[PDB]
Amino acid sequence: APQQINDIVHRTITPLIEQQKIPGMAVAVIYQGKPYYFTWGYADIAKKQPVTQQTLFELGSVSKTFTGVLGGDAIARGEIKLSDPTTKYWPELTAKQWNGITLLHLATYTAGGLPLQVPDEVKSSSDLLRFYQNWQPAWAPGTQRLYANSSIGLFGALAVKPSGLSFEQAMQTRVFQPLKLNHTWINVPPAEEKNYAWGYREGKAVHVSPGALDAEAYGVKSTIEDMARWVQSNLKPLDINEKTLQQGIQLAQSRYWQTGDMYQGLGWEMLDWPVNPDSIIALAARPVKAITPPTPAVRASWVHKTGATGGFGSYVAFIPEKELGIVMLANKNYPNPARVDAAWQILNALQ
Ligand SMILES: *[B]([O])([O])[C][N]S(=O)(=O)C1=[C][C]=C(C2=NN=N[N]2)[C]=[C]1
């Protein structure tokens, strides 16, 4: 590994792991297209299993990027349109607040105040229908962004209806398999359990809990190798041989809404590069300006996504015009600003 990369990564991540008491971490830097891997610490403290290039971590909300790309692929297949009313794919959603709420609003958190989480009380699918029928929007469609699992989770479930595939089968066959992400899972198979890191919350070993729309909003688990491949694919989607997937990748990085310095993609969020990290809270409602029509994927962008579960903390960022990116996977949910600080320190040095 070129010494510059070695040094910038170790000099940044080592103190980070010490300050944040992270049990285990894996990092990939993609530099001029090629990935370089680094690991530290423990996937399972009790059993003294080290983090390796094959360890699975919960991506948490970095999963929203897969959901956005799979939606993008479905659009490219002509199966759905972002301008389609939500009710077109869920006819039972008859309550009048849904008039004017499109797949775009769902995908981009702009439906009018759908909550961060589907309530824990929602167990059955009829419970889920009740939830969305009874939800009262605080705002008109397309006026305010509130980051929400119940918003993009629903987008993901609806985007796959026409295919006739379950969300998992569609994700596996249309995204994971074409990109050779053979160790990326919505449901960890028994064969891979030995690789599945424990997350650590208040020092307790924990895994993600089942919940409504989990798969679609925060349910993917992946290795640092596969996540490096996910970054390469998003960096360079013209490399991709499957036409609708290449298109879906590009659609997920289009700029649909602006709030401050940030643009909302499908799953991905983007800022113009260069940026300062200073530029890069349980509820944060923000007015959005519509980008009419959406701007095509911009190459000079910091494109990123943070992800958390109770026990894990993940971050991915890349800059297309520099062929440069980073994936940070940890089995502790440590503060976002620290992730972004470390990632900026690393990419800025190599750029
Ligand atoms: B995303 O990572 O930004 C979603 N964040 S979330 O706050 O909605 C969230 C946090 C933790 C879980 C979780 N379920 N079981 N363990 N952790 C789910 C959603």
User: Residues near 71 by Cβ (< 8 Å), separated by ≥ 6?
Assistant: 80, 103, 107, 155, 156, 159, 248, 251, 252, 266
Backbone angles phi, psi at 31, to 5 degrees: -130, 125
How many Cα atoms within 13 Å fall on the side-chain side of residue 23? Answer: 26
Residue 17 three-state SS: helix
Q: Are strands 255-259 and 289-295 parallel, antiparallel or unpaired?
A: antiparallel
Ligand 1: distance of its center to the CA of 311 in Å? 9
Q: What angle do CA 261, 61, 187 make, to 5 degrees?
A: 160
Contact, 285 vs 145, CB < 8 A?
Answer: yes
CB atoms within 10 A of CB 45: 15
Residue 201 three-state SS: strand
Q: What token pair was written down for 213?
A: 């729309």
> Does the Cβ of 141 fall within 6 Å of ligand 1?
no
151 labelled as ligand-binding? no
CB-based burial, 274-285: b 16+ in 10 Å, e otherwise: ebeeeebeeeee
Rounded to an integer, what distance in angstroms lies between the CA atom of residue 83 and that of residue 316? 29
Strand order in the sheet with 269-272: 49-50, 34-44, 24-31, 324-330, 312-319, 301-309, 269-272, 262-264, 255-259, 289-295
Helix intervals (H) in the chain = 3-20, 63-76, 103-108, 125-134, 149-159, 167-171, 214-218, 224-235, 243-252, 336-350
User: Residues near 235 by Cβ (< 8 Å), separated by ≥ 6?
Assistant: 30, 33, 318, 320, 323, 324, 325
> What residue's CA is closest to ligand 1, atom 13?
309
Q: What token pair was written down for 163?
A: 């295919």
Contact, 51 vs 59, CB < 8 A?
Answer: no
Ligand 1: distance of its center to the CA of 312 in Å? 9
Ligand 1: distance of its center to the CA of 309 in Å? 4
Contact, 174 vs 77, CB < 8 A?
Answer: no
CATH of the domain at 77: 3.40.710.10
DSSP 152-182: HHHHHHHHTTTTT--HHHHHIIIIITTTT-T
Q: Which atom of ligand 1 is nearest to the CA of 211?
A: 14
Closest CA to 103 of 82, 88, 87, 89: 82
Q: Which atom of ligand 1 is nearest to the CA of 64?
A: 1
Q: What token pair was written down for 332?
A: 């502790």
Give CA 351 to chain center in angstroms.
24
> What residue's CA is closest to ligand 1, atom 3?
61
Instruction: Examine the residue annotation and report whether 151 is marked as an active-site residue of this protein.
Output: no
Contact, 142 vs 114, CB < 8 A?
Answer: no
> Does the Cβ of 310 fall within 6 Å of ligand 1?
yes
Judged on CB neighbours under 10 Å (0-12, 13-18, 19+), 13 is buried
Q: What token pair was written down for 309?
A: 């579960």
DSSP 70-93: HHHHHHHTTS--TTSBGGGT-TT-
Contact, 53 vs 39, CB < 8 A?
Answer: yes
Q: Please measure the distance between the N-terminal and C-terminal CA atoms of the chain and give it in whole angstroms.
A: 16
Q: Kindly tell me the sign of the dihedral angle through the C-alpha atoms of 5, 9, 10, 11.
A: positive
CB atoms within 10 A of CB 115: 14
Rounded to an integer, what distance in angstroms lies between the CA atom of residue 12 and that of residue 136? 45
Residue 55 DSSP label: -
Which region, left, alpha or beta, applies to residue 29 given φ > 0 means left and ψ of -120 to 50 means alpha?
Answer: beta
351 labelled as ligand-binding? no
Overall domain count for the chain = 1
182 labelled as ligand-binding? no
Rounded to an integer, what distance in angstroms lies between the CA atom of residue 332 and that of residue 315? 12
Ligand 1: distance of its center to the CA of 60 in Å? 6
Rounded to an integer, what distance in angstroms lies between the CA atom of residue 100 and that of residue 116? 21
Closest CA to 80 of 154, 176, 146, 137: 154
DSSP bridge pairs for 315: 306, 328
DSSP bridge pairs for 145: 286
308 labelled as ligand-binding? yes
> Does the Cβ of 218 fall within 6 Å of ligand 1?
yes
Contact, 13 vs 22, CB < 8 A?
Answer: no
Rounded to an integer, what distance in angstroms lies between the CA atom of residue 5 and that of residue 101? 46
- Bond from prior residue into 189 cis (ω within 30 degrees of 0): no
6 labelled as ligand-binding? no
- Elucidation technique: X-ray
Ligand 1: distance of its center to the CA of 117 in Å? 8
Residue 281 three-state SS: coil
Residue type, 136: Q
Top mutation candidate among 117, 304, 309 for ligand 1, by most atoms within 8 Å of CB: 309
Residue 51 DSSP label: P
Secondary structure element (H or E) that encloses residue 24, with its range:
strand 24-31
Q: What token pair was written down for 108?
A: 């981009």
| Crossing angle (nearest 10°) for helices 243-252 and 224-235 | 90
How many Cα atoms within 13 Å fall on the side-chain side of residue 255? Answer: 23
Rounded to an integer, what distance in angstroms lies between the CA atom of residue 132 and that of residue 257? 24
Contact, 111 vs 151, CB < 8 A?
Answer: yes
Give CA 250 to chain center in angstroms.
15
Rounded to an integer, what distance in angstroms lies between the CA atom of residue 96 and that of residue 93? 9
Q: Which atom of ligand 1 is nearest to the CA of 310?
A: 17
Q: What token pair was written down for 313?
A: 């903390």
CB atoms within 10 A of CB 328: 30
Rounded to an integer, what distance in angstroms lies between the CA atom of residue 43 and that of residue 244? 36
Rounded to an integer, what distance in angstroms lies between the CA atom of residue 56 and that of residue 161? 29
Tell me how far CA of residue 24 lies from CA of 59, 268, 338, in angstroms: 14, 25, 16
Residue 351 three-state SS: coil
Range of 241's domain?
1-351
